[PDB]
Structure to design on (465 residues):
C-alpha cells in the first residue's frame, strides 16, 4: 500500500497544530489509540513513521535490520558533526567505526586498566566527596554529571578530573548547556523549518559555538597524545585510535583514517552525556519515595558484599533484588521515550505498508517499557517487575531501554556497569534523607524536549558508623 495511516496534515505545518500541549509524547500516544501501533505523523513538512509495542519495534530493527538501521538527521547538530561519529554516522563510515569501538571496548583493559577498575575508583572518589559533605542537603545533578563524564574521560583521555577542577566544570557546563539548547522551544522548531530558519541566527549558531570550543580541548589533547605515544603500551582510547591509524596507513583503503579523529571522540562524549547521570538522578529520587526499597537493597549489599570492600561487577549475579531495583529504575525513567531517530535505507514493506528510502522513523520505546502485558500496572515504581515468585531475577523481551538491533546502544556495557557500581557503592556507605515526606514526592518527569528529566530535589547522604 502506502505510508501508514494518520491525522490529516496541512501543507507545511504537517500535523503540528493537532499535537497536545505540551505532552508531545502524549500526542504520539493519542495518535496510537486512534491509528494503531503503526501510524504516520507529519512533523512539519516532513513525514515521520512512528512504531509502538515490542512486536513492532522488534519487527523493524531485528527482523528488518537491512532496512531500519539508519540514523536520522538532527539538524541542530549535523552542521557540526557532518556525519562523523558512531551515533551520527551511517553506511560504511558507521559499519567501520561501530566495529572498531566494539573491539576496542572488548579488548580494553586487556592490556591496560579495566573499565570496572575505573568505575571503582571514581566510585571511591565519589564517596569521599559525599562524605566531605558532612550530611548536608544538596542537589546531586552536578556530581552525577561529573562522575559519568569522568568515566568517559578516564577511558578516552586516560584520566579523570578533580570535581573542583575549573577547567573541568567549564567543559561540563558547556555540554549541559548545549543539551538544553537543543531541548529548547527553538531547537525543536529548528528541526523542522531549518530549511529557511538556518539563515537567521538562533540557538543553532550558539550550539555550534559551544561544540567548537569543547572540540578545541580534544584536538589539543590528541596532540599531547601523539607526543607521548608508546606503540607497545597504549594508555587509553585515543592512544588506541592513533595506533589504529598507523597500522591503517599501511593499507590502501583506510575508510577509517579518512575520518575526523576529534569529532568521532566528541561524538562519543555526546552520546554518553546526560545518560546515566539522569538515570542515577532519577534513581535516588525514587529511593526517597520508596525508602523500604532503599533499605532492602542495603541489606542485600550488607549480606552479599558487607560494609567495607568495594562492590564489584561479579557481585551482580548474587544480588538479584538490586539488579531488579536497577532495572525498574531504568524502565520507569524512560530516559528517551522515543529512541534516536532512524531512517530506512532501502524501500521496504512493513505490515503491508510501503515505506520509502530515506523516511525518518521513531521507535517509541516508552511504549515497550510500559506494556501492561509485560508490566502489571506499568505507571508505578515496582522492582517486583523484574522478580519472580522465588524472588529470582526476571528478565523480559520488553525491557529495551537501550533499543535493539544494529544501532543498539554502544554504551550498554559501560552503562550497566556504572549504574551498579555507583548505585551499590553509594548505598554501601550512605543512607538517604530529605525534608520532604515520601508520599509528597512528585515523580513527574519534566519531559522537556526529547528526554525525560526528573524534577530537581534536595537530598542528603548519611554515613552508617
Ligand atoms: C542509561 C544510559 C543509556 C541509555 C538508556 C542509552 C540508550 C541508548 C539508545 C536508546 C540508543 C539508540 C539506539 C537506537 O537507535 O535504538 C543508544 C545509542 C547509543 N548510545 Fe546509548 N545509552 C545510554 C548510555 C550511553 C552511554 C554512557 C554511552 C557512551 C558510551 C552511549 C553511547 C551510545 C552510542 C555510541 C549509541 C549509538 C551507537 C550506534 O548507534 O551504533 N549510550 N543508547
Ligand atoms: C543524537 C544525540 O542525542 C543524544 O545523544 C541524546 C542523549 C544522549 O544519550 C543518547 C545516547 N545514548 N540524551 C539526550 C538528553 C538527548 C537530548 O536530545 O536531550 C535533549 C539526546 C539527543 C541529543 C541531541 C539531539 C537528539 C537527541 Cl535524541
Ligand atoms: C524531528 C523534529 O524534531 C522535533 O520536532 C522534535 C520535537 C518536536 O517539538 C515540538 C514542539 N512544538 N520534540 C521532540 C520530542 C523531538 C524529539 O526528537 O523527541 C524524540 C524533536 C525531534 C524530533 C525528531 C528528530 C529530532 C528532534 Cl530534536
Amino acid at each position: 500500500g502506502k505510508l501508514p495511516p494518520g491525522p490529516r496534515p496541512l501543507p507545511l505545518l504537517g500535523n503540528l497544530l493537532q499535537m497536545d500541549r505540551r505532552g508531545l509524547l502524549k500526542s504520539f500516544l493519542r495518535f496510537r489509540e486512534k491509528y494503531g501501533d503503526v501510524f504516520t505523523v507529519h512533523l512539519g513538512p516532513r513525514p515521520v513513521v512512528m512504531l509502538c509495542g515490542v512486536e513492532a519495534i522488534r519487527e523493524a530493527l531485528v527482523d528488518k535490520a537491512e532496512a531500519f538501521s539508519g540514523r536520522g538527521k538532527i539538524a541542530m547538530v549535523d552542521p557540526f558533526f557532518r556525519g562523523y561519529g558512531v551515533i551520527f554516522a551511517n553506511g560504511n563510515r558507521w559499519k567501520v567505526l561501530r566495529r572498531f569501538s566494539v573491539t576496542t571496548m572488548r579488548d580494553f583493559g586487556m592490556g591496560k586498566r579495566s573499565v570496572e577498575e575505573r568505575i571503582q575508583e571514581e566510585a571511591q572518589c565519589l564517596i569521599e566527596e559525599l562524605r566531605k559533605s558532612k550530611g548536608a542537603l544538596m542537589d546531586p545533578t552536578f556530581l552525577f554529571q561529573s562522575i559519568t563524564a569522568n568515566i568517559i574521560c578516564s577511558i578516552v583521555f586516560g584520566k579523570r578530573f578533580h570535581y573542583q577542577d575549573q577547567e573541568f566544570l567549564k567543559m561540563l557546563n558547556l555540554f549541559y548547556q548545549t543539551f538544553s539548547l537543543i531541548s529548547s522551544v527553538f531547537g525543536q522548531l529548528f528541526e523542522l523549518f531549518s530549511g529557511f530558519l538556518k539563515h537567521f541566527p538562533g540557538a543553532h549558531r550558539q550550539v555550534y559555538k559551544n561544540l567548537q570550543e569543547i572540540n578545541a580541548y580534544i584536538g589539543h589533547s590528541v596532540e599531547k597524545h601523539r607526543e607521548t605515544l608508546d606503540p607497545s603500551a597504549p594508555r587509553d582510547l585515543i592512544d588506541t585510535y592513533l595506533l589504529h591509524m598507523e597500522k591503517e596507513k599501511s593499507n590502501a583503503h583506510s575508510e577509517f583514517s579518512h575520518q575526523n579523529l576529534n569529532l568521532n571522540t566528541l561524538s562519543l562524549f555526546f552520546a554518553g552525556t546526560e545518560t546515566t547521570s539522569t538515570t542515577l538522578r532519577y534513581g535516588f529520587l525514587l529511593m526517597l519515595k520508596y525508602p523500604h526499597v532503599a533499605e532492602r537493597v542495603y541489606r542485600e549489599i550488607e549480606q552479599v558484599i558487607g560494609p567495607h570492600r568495594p562492590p564489584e561487577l561479579h557481585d551482580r549475579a548474587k544480588m538479584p533484588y538490586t539488579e531488579a531495583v536497577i532495572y525498574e529504575i531504568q524502565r520507569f525513567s524512560d530516559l528517551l521515550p522515543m529512541g534516536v531517530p532512524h531512517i530506512v535505507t532501502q524501500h521496504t514493506s512493513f505490515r503491508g505498508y510501503i515505506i520509502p528510502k530515506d523516511t525518518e522513523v521513531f521507535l517509541i520505546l516508552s511504549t515497550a517499557l510500559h506494556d501492561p502485558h509485560y508490566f502489571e500496572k506499568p505507571d508505578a515504581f515496582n522492582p517486583d517487575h523484574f522478580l519472580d515468585a522465588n524472588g529470582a531475577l526476571k528478565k523480559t523481551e520488553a525491557f529495551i531501554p537501550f533499543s535493539l538491533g544494529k544501532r543498539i546502544c554502544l554504551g550498554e556495557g559501560i552503562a550497566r556497569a556504572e549504574l551498579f557500581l555507583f548505585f551499590t557503592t553509594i548505598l554501601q556507605n550512605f543512607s538517604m534523607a530529605s525534608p520532604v515526606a515520601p508520599e509528597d514526592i512528585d515523580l513527574t518527569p519534566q519531559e522537556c524536549g526529547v528526554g525525560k528529566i526528573p524534577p530537581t530535589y534536595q537530598i542528603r547522604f548519611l554515613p552508617r558508623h
